[PDB]
Amino acid sequence: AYTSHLSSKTGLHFGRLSLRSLTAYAPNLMLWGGASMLGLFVFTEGWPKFQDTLYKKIPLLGPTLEDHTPPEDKPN
């Protein structure tokens, strides 16, 4: 057998990036999105609206965030 040519064709690129790199970067990019969303969760936890929507819907750790001091003792 003798090969006089190449069986090769140019892939898809935009100069800086190509899909060769992005098909390998995509699972770690989704993991970085998950890590950044967890960082947003921990840095915006003292927020009361996010506290009552998400951070009290957590099953076991949820009711530890509530302090139900009675309405007989609050100035406002």
Ligand X SMILES: CCCCCCCCCCCCCCCC(=O)OC[C@H](COP(=O)(O)OCCN)OC(=O)CCCCCCCCCCCCCCC
Return residues touching ligand X (CB under 6 A).
43-44, 46-48
Asked if 19 and 12 count as a contact pair (C-beta separation under 8 A), the reply is yes
Partner whose binding site includes residue 44, from ligand X, another protein, none (CB under 5 to 8 Å by kind)? ligand X
Kindly tell me which of 18 and 44 has the beta carbon lying closer to ligand X. Answer: 44
> At closest approach, how far in Å is the CB of 68 from another protein?
14
Asked if 65 and 51 count as a contact pair (C-beta separation under 8 A), the reply is yes
Contacts of 63 (CB under 8 A, 6+ apart): 56
Stretch that binds another protein, among 20-28, 37-45, 54-62, 68-76 (CB under 8 A): 68-76
Q: Which residues pair with 13 in a beta bridge?
A: 18
Give residues in contact with another protein (CB under 8 A).
69, 71-76
